[PDB]
From a paper:
Mpf2Ba1 is a 53.2 kDa protein isolated from Pseudomonas monteilii through a multi-step purification process informed by artificial diet bioactivity screening against WCR larvae.
We first solved the X-ray structure of Mpf2Ba1-1167 at 2.1 Å resolution. In Mpf2Ba1, each of the three β-sheets of the β-prism, arranged around a local three-fold axis, contains a unique repeated motif: Asp-Leu-Asn (DLN). Structurally, the metal chelation seems to tuck the three β-prism loops into gaps between the adjacent β-sheets, increasing domain stability. In the monomer, the N-terminus lies adjacent to one side of the MACPF domain, forming a short β-strand–β-sheet interaction with the central β-sheet, and two more H-bonds: between Asp292, stabilized by the conserved Pro291, and the N-terminal backbone, and between one of the nitrogen atoms of N-terminal His18 imidazole ring and the oxygen atom of Ser54, highly conserved among bacterial MACPFs. The X-ray density for this loop is clear, albeit weaker and with higher B-factors than the surrounding residues, indicating greater flexibility. We solved the Mpf2Ba1 X-ray structure and showed how N-terminal residues inhibit the association of monomers in the soluble form.
Author numbering: 2 to 482
Write the structure that this text describes.
Amino acid sequence: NIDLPQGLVNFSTQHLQLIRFKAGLNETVLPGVEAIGLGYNPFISYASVNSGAVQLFDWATAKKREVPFKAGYFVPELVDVQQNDSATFTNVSGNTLSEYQRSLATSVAIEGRYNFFSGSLSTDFDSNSLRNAENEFTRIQQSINLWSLRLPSVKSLRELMLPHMRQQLDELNVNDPKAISRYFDRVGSHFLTGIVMGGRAILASSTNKLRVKRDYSVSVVAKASYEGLTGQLSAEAKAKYGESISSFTQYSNTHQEVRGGDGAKAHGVFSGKKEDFQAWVDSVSASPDFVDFVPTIPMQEIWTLCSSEAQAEAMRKHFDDVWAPAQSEKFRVKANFIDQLVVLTGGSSTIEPPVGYSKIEYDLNAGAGGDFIYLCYHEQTWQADRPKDAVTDIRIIFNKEPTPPGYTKLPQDLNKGAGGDDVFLCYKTEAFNTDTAINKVTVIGGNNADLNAPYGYLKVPGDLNRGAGGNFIYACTFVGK
Ligand SMILES: [Mg+2]
């Protein structure tokens, strides 16, 4: 029997009817033509029209041809239309946030080493989850495809442009870096060329990779959980994946999104009785929306519509050197790290350290008598200024060994008054480095000297009950990497 993650559906509608009205498109023009040729900022969202969006092309007056599979509807002759009446998955995952960002950015064919769909991070996932180095990330999208539209990058495209949009591009003052930035901000660095109309259901999840069942990959487990929530798991998938799904829900935070179809049936797609999902699916036909990309040609660079080589190269250069790095930097998010440790001592387990500090919940005199003692950490957020120093190493010293150079030494005795050796935690900090900064510290205890380290952690040598009895006790560290 299976625990499924609970949430509220976020239903999105795009503004397509209003975009069509603005373009003056006839109702015989296939749904989706209004989105082809839209100026696009590829940083903001995954396969969403930004409310900004300006059409470059005059599809109202362009020559049309009938859609063969949909009698009575028309598409510009230049636009290829492919029927695709199917349900497919567009799944992205990463073992780390940066790996998830790469995997998102490269889920479609867009050139440049940037955080391309990372504006989605602020709604797909939550702040604390994004910055927890214990977490991996999945985005499961089931697309309810009806058709796709493709605009091939043909030499005749400038001619199809709205005259005012063509003039605006041609008169861009490309000696002025601020004008080029503004043009990218207000019309786009790209334009849409390969879009899928229909519906989508999305489950975006942050999962504790150090605690979830590892029989299967998080992508597989996340997809099985999605299928659970929508009533689409077979009896065999339930038997095989049920335990994994339960673990997933115990160790994940999930976000539910629906687009396309009837908004009144959207809440309910994740109920999951199959009939509830299916009633939403069956509504997609009557209200398609832009939901996914044609992966091979999602969009073209806007300077391909420049008349001249000189203007195109000034715009490409500005993109790579100024505008895109500025955009991509708004989504550079690194995990919280530890920058300071204190020790707390007291007469019970409910003692609390001072305000910035959280207890590792293991009495460092466990089984040995004496005070309740807790190692406590301060979590620091990463900021591209400076940032600050990360704890990179912990070293336990005993009795009268000298503080190693230059470690800080916490002067409280991790054996007080349980007897035994005098035990002292030391640590060093260095300039923040992703390869080095300790994200998490824990403490383990056991009845034998050589304990199992928590998955992903390293044990710090030095028993924190050394010379007393009780348990063997070690600090352990985790570097997300
Ligand atoms: Mg102790």
